[PDB]
Amino acid sequence: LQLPWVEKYRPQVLSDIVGNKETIDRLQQIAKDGNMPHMIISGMPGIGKTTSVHCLAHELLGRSYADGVLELNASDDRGIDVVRNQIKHFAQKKLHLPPGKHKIVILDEADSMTAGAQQALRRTMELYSNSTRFAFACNQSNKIIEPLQSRCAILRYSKLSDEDVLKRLLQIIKLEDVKYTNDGLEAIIFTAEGDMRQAINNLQSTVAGHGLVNADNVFKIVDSPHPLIVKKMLLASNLEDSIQILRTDLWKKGYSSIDIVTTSFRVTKNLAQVKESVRLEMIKEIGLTHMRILEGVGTYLQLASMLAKIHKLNNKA
Amino acid sequence: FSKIKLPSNRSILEKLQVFDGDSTTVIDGFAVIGFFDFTSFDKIRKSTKIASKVLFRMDVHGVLSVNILSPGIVIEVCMLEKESIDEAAQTEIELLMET
Amino acid sequence: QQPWVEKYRPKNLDEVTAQDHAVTVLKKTLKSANLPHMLFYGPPGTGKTSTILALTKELYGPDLMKSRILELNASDERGISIVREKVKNFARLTVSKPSKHDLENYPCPPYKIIILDEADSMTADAQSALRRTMETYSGVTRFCLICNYVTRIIDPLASRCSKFRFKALDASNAIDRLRFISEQENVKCDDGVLERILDISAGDLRRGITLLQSASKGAQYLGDGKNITSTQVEELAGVVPHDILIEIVEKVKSGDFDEIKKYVNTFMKSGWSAASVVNQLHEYYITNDNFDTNFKNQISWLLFTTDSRLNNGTNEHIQLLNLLVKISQL
Amino acid sequence: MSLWVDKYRPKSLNALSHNEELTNFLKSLSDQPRDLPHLLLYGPNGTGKKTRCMALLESIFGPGVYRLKIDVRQFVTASNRKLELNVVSSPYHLEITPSDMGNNDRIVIQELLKEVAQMERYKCVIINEANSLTKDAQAALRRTMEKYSKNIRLIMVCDSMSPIIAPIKSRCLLIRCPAPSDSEISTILSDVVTNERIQLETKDILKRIAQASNGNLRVSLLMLESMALNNELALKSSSPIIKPDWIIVIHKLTRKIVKERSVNSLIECRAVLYDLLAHCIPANIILKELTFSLLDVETLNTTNKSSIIEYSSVFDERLSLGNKAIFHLEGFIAKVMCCLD
Amino acid sequence: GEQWYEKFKPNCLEQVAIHKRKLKDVQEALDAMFLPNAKHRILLLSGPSGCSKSTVIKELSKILVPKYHKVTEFRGQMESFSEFLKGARYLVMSNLSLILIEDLPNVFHIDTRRRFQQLILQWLYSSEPLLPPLVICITECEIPENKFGIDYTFSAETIMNKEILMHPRLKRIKFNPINSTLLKKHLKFICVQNMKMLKEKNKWNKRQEVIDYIAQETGDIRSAITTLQFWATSSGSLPISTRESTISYFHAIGKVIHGSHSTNNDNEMINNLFENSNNLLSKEDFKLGILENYNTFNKGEFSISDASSIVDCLSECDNMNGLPESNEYGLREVRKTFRNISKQGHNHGTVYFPREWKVRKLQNSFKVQAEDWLNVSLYKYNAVHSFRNITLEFGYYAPLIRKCQ
Amino acid sequence: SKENLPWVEKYRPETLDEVYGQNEVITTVRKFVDEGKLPHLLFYGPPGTGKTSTIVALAREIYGKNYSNMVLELNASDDRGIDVVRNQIKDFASTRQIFSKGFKLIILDEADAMTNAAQNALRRVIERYTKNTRFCVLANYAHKLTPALLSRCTRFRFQPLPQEAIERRIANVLVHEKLKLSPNAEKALIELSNGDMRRVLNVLQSCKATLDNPDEDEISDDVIYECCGAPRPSDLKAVLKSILEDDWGTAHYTLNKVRSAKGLALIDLIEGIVKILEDYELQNEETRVHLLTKLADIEYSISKGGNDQIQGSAVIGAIKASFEN
DNA sequence: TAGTGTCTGCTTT
DNA sequence: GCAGACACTA
Ligand SMILES: Nc1ncnc2c1ncn2[C@@H]1O[C@H](COP(=O)(O)OP(=O)(O)OP(O)(O)=S)[C@@H](O)[C@H]1O
Ligand SMILES: Nc1ncnc2c1ncn2[C@@H]1O[C@H](COP(=O)(O)OP(=O)(O)OP(O)(O)=S)[C@@H](O)[C@H]1O
Ligand SMILES: Nc1ncnc2c1ncn2[C@@H]1O[C@H](COP(=O)(O)OP(=O)(O)OP(O)(O)=S)[C@@H](O)[C@H]1O
Ligand SMILES: Nc1ncnc2c1ncn2[C@@H]1O[C@H](COP(=O)(O)OP(=O)(O)OP(O)(O)=S)[C@@H](O)[C@H]1O
Ligand SMILES: Nc1ncnc2c1ncn2[C@@H]1O[C@H](COP(=O)(O)OP(=O)(O)O)[C@@H](O)[C@H]1O
Ligand SMILES: [Mg+2]
Ligand SMILES: [Mg+2]
Ligand SMILES: [Mg+2]
Ligand SMILES: [Mg+2]
């Protein structure tokens, strides 16, 4: 019974966590001093937010982790009354902690929690701010209401760079004693596109299916991300080359047309080297194609016509 | 913490022996911990409303078979234990039990 | 006492005509039990419902409909929860033990048929539930999918169900059936009346049957022993006379906007649907050889655009006026 | 008893004046009521298709068809929320209206038609404004009138046949009701003013009313009542042609658009459109009459008229495929001012 | 340790970050309330989150109660709040305790909000001698994505159904975000209180730009205090993240029409507006706002072609069944054309809400009038004409025919 | 009993060796299960590629007789509300295995049709209850899935099955059923397959039912085209040649004759026309744009409904106008 | 004394 | 982002 590489090597201390060096160092000073304020952590999923919160709580508590934490997650009875009662009962107890230490309550995935529960949470924090503390884990801070964000410190998380992910990959490779190649690691980074969990899963698939980590094996087990192919084909000059690229990539690898349309919409929204008028015309054409596909006409001919219209408005005859 | 205790009186504890995984070697001084969800006990509460004798039997795998006797009919129910105890709770269960 | 549409509905698989592949497959499946899921699609009034009803009648028998065959349609509520529970239940009901009379009177197969009429009016979640249910209960339960439009049906349903395309009933496809119906009902027609009726209703035998019934009723009411002509059925159907179409073409050819506008106003006062007018104008323009290729291409595109606009449910006056103005300015 | 439409309503096939061929067609259909197929009536508004349906029902059944009864019942569409339909009842037949919302209309028709069908000497129901459907109740109709074609006969009356899907037109007989010519409307007006013993200085006033109404019997009768009551039952040749305030507002907006082409003119036109739509008036007919009012201006040339009619068709398609109503009218008017100069 | 915003809680009235005009207005309103002749039965104080709402009442009741505890805050259900209100009704003499309704009970359900409304109506119209003072504090913040009022924007107008607000015995005083000058002064006060810890680290020489950025970035005093505490506690080289605020309904239209001064490029501004405020820009009756407000770019003095293109594009967007791509395309087109025509822009017109509810009310009035006309006509004799033909023929001819006869 | 089921369900694979085409995925998952390591596999691909069949074969291979009480199969046919999902999967994963010393596999067919909150609860359970319980995600659409789910689950892509897999499955079916097909019929079936096995099995069953005797005969391309209704390549070539050569009269006559003699549909005809037109070269860069736009509008109109003759004439006119540039 | 900063709009169903 | 009117000391 062997745990997967994602979960077998979960960091237990803040030193093992890589990525935002300044934020990790700040968390280390918070753990050492003990002054724990209310925090909200948001960013790209799977970059080490919940893991960082757990490591900070462990380093702050030690032997008090048995009772000093109330980890209420999304997969729970997250109502308005039972949650309020549970948090009130948790906040109306005292334990033998040093004066510089406080109880920590972790609420992972607070975005999906109901707004009435958010108001109850605000009432609990206002009533029992002196004893317990709250640490939030989420992907974006938009879903958290403004008054709750007012009573906390927001620490935005950025995407992990090449250096941190590569360093973590090297440590895990040294721990597992697995032969690797620099080109294979570069391919793993390119396919991950800044994701740590995805990189670990891809490395595990490469070592299980083929052994040695090579770029060819990584490309064989998993294809390149579709946003990159969408961006490559959208900025193509000639219509024939873009048509051939979209066909030979998306239809040969088996990509759904609605997924292609959604990815193209996201790429056009995030595109930079394009004029505003061209961008809005392409957005309108994407919306028309999306409506056509959603109604039921999602053949390759619709995608080809969409590319033809995009190239026609790009060239302007 | 809620503790309901069944005493050693033979009126309600006529037979109780702890085995060592061989079903023949009875031992004394060994503790068995069973982590069961509230749902199964709530479902079984109605089944035990009218009965004469209730038999409890679980193995090292954690699955629990409860026999209900009420000649009368026989009702046997099989249960499932949780995957793992919460952290290291079982220690504090005994530490409160001889407390 | 019964309209000819319902009175002459084919109750047997040999009564339907102009359908070779589907009828042969069903007939050969009558002696076996390897019946796949059928996706019935085609033009409206082609005979998919009649075909599935005949297959169900010849498969089990009148007694097994009450306890073995259940159909879905738009007549009742078809919400996601209701459809899910109903379809899962009826795909979980056991195969009813047949009586002896069914056994030595009909070749009863060991499965059951679930009929999904007008399946194009179903949501994506309902279709996903249906396809998952029919995969997980493919043992002794079968699903029949009937829809006018294939595109509205999701791709997995089209992949899992066998595609049985229903060819449109042209003049030569249903001329024999119309002749048999006329002979059975004692209807007298001239040489080229049934063909004209079939040409009026392109791939639609129900419309032709209704037109024939109306013509027969008119002939019976008139009293004299006369034969029905093409003019009578054309005017009952709603076909614009050729003289008025020629006048419309002449008005369009002339470069006067006021004359075209007043002619369109009078035509709308006549209350004639512009779809038939568009079809007749298209037939006249493509059939005529007095026009060049470029003008024919442009007018075909304009008529296609006007038909697409009319199919959405717009004001017929504005669409026909715009089409005539665009044609006159070509 | 206080209107021309109700007092002098024909109640028989022989009582009908215009469309003798249509009367013969209805007589032929009523010759064998048992073999009557499903009917679909399409034609101009105000022609009298409802009158033909009532005459056919009276011929098939007899007395008591024109006697109507009122009953009310509620249909549940979501939770405890229910919407009531003002269904009108009658012996030997029945009539309904699609006054409900576009989404609950389908289930209301489903429940009502399932209740009416039952088992059974059939019952005939008239479907007023069958064209005003969201392509959802039409599936229920095409299923029920095919499966339950033993005791129910749906009768469909509508002004436009294009919104009706092809299967419904296939299963239902196409009945044509052309609007009467000027002579027939003039004869009807002469008869009804003879029966009302009102003064008539000349016969040209009836012709003017017929031309103004544009082949609409209801509009002609209401205009005749207006001129009779305003002039104390003494018609005059110099009496002005009375028109409804809606057409007057449309014409005034057309003149304002032709005269002034600016942004303030655009916002006042938007305000007028909002006020007009506040009167429960559909936007499609508003755009249609605005187009006809813009097209009759002699100042505009052929190119401007062609551009206006093209934009009108495009925005009619947009309104048909859209949800809101103000946007398409506003775009049509703005495009008209853009292409005018 | 203890939080700065709790340790540095104000003691005197001058410490509260409140405007002089706002302080005078709330003082006058309260003083009017405490007289035996009560002009306003309840006091409603809306506003954004963390604009020093509750503290104003707290220190005001601290300074005024001995003149003639401090407050009675209701903990956050239905019958409990009914009992709390009834008990507050019987606290008038020898105590003079103000009744605070901060952190109001759950209103996201229909039943509890309705019973709250009837409780408010019952207490507002109670003809009982004397009156216990009562203050209601409501935080204006929209609920993110998870109808008809709640779940779109949580504010005073959402909870109260235009009846409590339109009452003589109420004084609605909306609160503004904390001023930049007041925020800077309070941050400087915190710094001169924490001089020792400030001199402990190398943060005193790099203080002015941080204080200015914190004051100009957010209008919440509590969030600013928390950010200052986090920055001071941190060793250094750590970027500061603030409490991201919200954009109002009219603010979104103003940003779409004119643009944004902070971000000159339109693409990034549009992307940020879509990401942060997807609910506002994807919910209905917002394209109507653009269609009614685009005329005020130059008081209706721009080209007719741009307006025609705008409305045509809006029609195409409406044709896409309200897809997010349609909204993005429409907003981008409007922003692009206004940026193009902004070469000559001055004296922009004021904006307004689109007149959509009035049209619906008039349509409902027309419907009920038509129903009454059908009822009376059917009672008089037999007359059915469906509903479509009424507005075209019977909506005008029948009224004048009946009037003349 | 067998031999009374549709060929789609009759030929359902039961072992990993019975899954053709995706050799790399099969080898990778075999290597994963040989080491006792199941890293929350996620399967993505077009329908008919063999996702649920592959997971069923894998569960049979690694468990055997434990499928009845260890594998929890959830799908669109079962209610998957937020409360239902959290309760059911929490109860299943939190409970320890009965006697087998192996990971617990949960199969979630059609995972794209769940709410966002249900997906969040599922992704929390995946990371929380993972000591003994693993998860399988099956979905043809990735835009309806939370991006967090795609990170914790290893994504495997199911490519359309190549010609070799289709040919091998056809040979196996012919061995099982004692049937013969011409090489031209095999090529036509390869062309019509479009990377789908269910369609191939369905049309093979339909063609076998079409034959008057299953034995002592050979299946040609003509019977396949007649039963499936697909137009012949020669018919499409003749129609295209008539369009490109005959101006408007005899071209329309030829199109009507082609559509009337065999009753071909317009959608398949235009699909074939554009399929051959894709092979042709166009050194103008503008004719192709007009062709694609006009053809897409034609398909949209046909989906919305209309007149077949008018649509066909529109196709002819659009092709002629585009080729006149 | 004219700029800079800053309150108030502008929302009802 | 806009305007209309007021705050506040140079
Ligand atoms: N900086 C890191 N260094 C090493 N491993 C990491 C790092 N970040 C993430 N991981 C790995 O990724 C796994 C998932 O991390 P999580 O904290 O659960 O992701 P997340 O940031 O909370 O985002 P979610 O869970 O999708 S909302 C961890 O258990 C680690 O194995
Ligand atoms: N092959 C056929 N031979 C004889 N009559 C036929 C045939 N196909 C259809 N009909 C006639 O068509 C009428 C109705 O047939 P249906 O089966 O309801 O058509 P349809 O395929 O169901 O069209 P829908 O339901 O609108 S898609 C009846 O009068 C049948 O007799
Ligand atoms: N100088 C200050 N002026 C005002 N408040 C201050 C000051 N210094 C610290 N604070 C704190 O800032 C907070 C302001 O309280 P309020 O905004 O009135 O409460 P509130 O209205 O409930 O805020 P929300 O909207 O619920 S987050 C209190 O916690 C004060 O203790
Ligand atoms: N690799 C394969 N080799 C042979 N037959 C296959 C293969 N993959 C799929 N099939 C056939 O396809 C049938 C249905 O495939 P399924 O796996 O049940 O559906 P699916 O491919 O998962 O598509 P969906 O829409 O996601 S259920 C099986 O019963 C097999 O007969
Ligand atoms: N043949 C006819 N002779 C005389 N009047 C007629 C005739 N047909 C219709 N009408 C007139 O039409 C009016 C009713 O029209 P209506 O049925 O409402 O038209 P629609 O069916 O288009 O709504 C009646 O007042 C009646 O006087
Ligand atoms: Mg996490
Ligand atoms: Mg049918
Ligand atoms: Mg407060
Ligand atoms: Mg599957």
Residue numbers in the entry:
A (entry chain B): 7 to 323
B (entry chain G): 202 to 271, 302 to 330
C (entry chain D): 24 to 353
D (entry chain E): 1 to 120, 134 to 354
E (entry chain A): 63 to 130, 146 to 153, 162 to 231, 237 to 495
F (entry chain C): 9 to 333
Publication text:
The 9-1-1 DNA checkpoint clamp is loaded onto 5′-recessed DNA to activate the DNA damage checkpoint that arrests the cell cycle. Rad24 replaces Rfc1 and loads the DNA damage 9-1-1 ring onto DNA to signal DNA damage. Here we describe the first two structures of the Rad24-RFC–9-1-1 clamp bound to DNA and nucleotides, in closed and open conformations, at a resolution of 3.2 Å.
We found that Mec3 of the closed form undergoes a 45° in-plane rotation away from Ddc1 to generate the 27-Å gap in the open form of the 9-1-1 clamp. The third loop is hook-like, projecting from the Rad24 AAA+ domain, and interacts with Ddc1 of the 9-1-1 clamp in the closed state. Therefore, we suggest that this Rad24 loop controls the 9-1-1 ring opening. In both closed and open 9-1-1 clamp states, the first four interfaces (Rad24:Rfc4, Rfc4:Rfc3, Rfc3:Rfc2 and Rfc2:Rfc5) are occupied by ATPγS and Mg2+, and an adenosine diphosphate (ADP) occupies the last interface between Rfc5 and the A′ subdomain of Rad24. This observation suggests that the 9-1-1 gate opening does not require ATP hydrolysis by Rad24-RFC.
